[PDB]
Amino acid sequence: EAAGERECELPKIDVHLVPDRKKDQYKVGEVLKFSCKPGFTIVGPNSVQCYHFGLSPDLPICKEQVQSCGPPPELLNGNVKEKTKEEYGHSEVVEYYCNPRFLMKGPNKIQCVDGEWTTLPVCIVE
Incomplete structure (x- = not known):
């Protein structure tokens, strides 16, 4: 069973990070734009895609x-x-x-x- 695919679930982001979608499972090709909490700045990739190997690139941080x-x-x-x-x-x-x-x-x-x-x-x- 299962195709060659390997779909995504929201990984362990930063506690002060918030994804645009903020859904539990991301479909392949979903762009998880991130942002941080209201008083936090997101530094790094503010948009990662769900690829068939996982969410990539790796997650940004909050400052x-x-x-x-x-x-x-x-x-x-x-x-x-x-x-x-x-x-x-x-x-x-x-x-x-x-x-x-x-x-x-x-x-x-x-x-x-x-x-x-x-x-x-x-x-x-x-």
């Missing part, structure tokens, strides 16, 4: 204390349109804008994760 990352980086052919505060914070996104000659490819905003900002929008001439 209450993160960095504020200071001000955001510059944009290559734009700038930050928002008020650059000396202290942003985790999950604080920064709306950028590129010049009126470019198309903005990636996310115009980026949020700082742990203490590192995510991948910039990047714009190209239209």
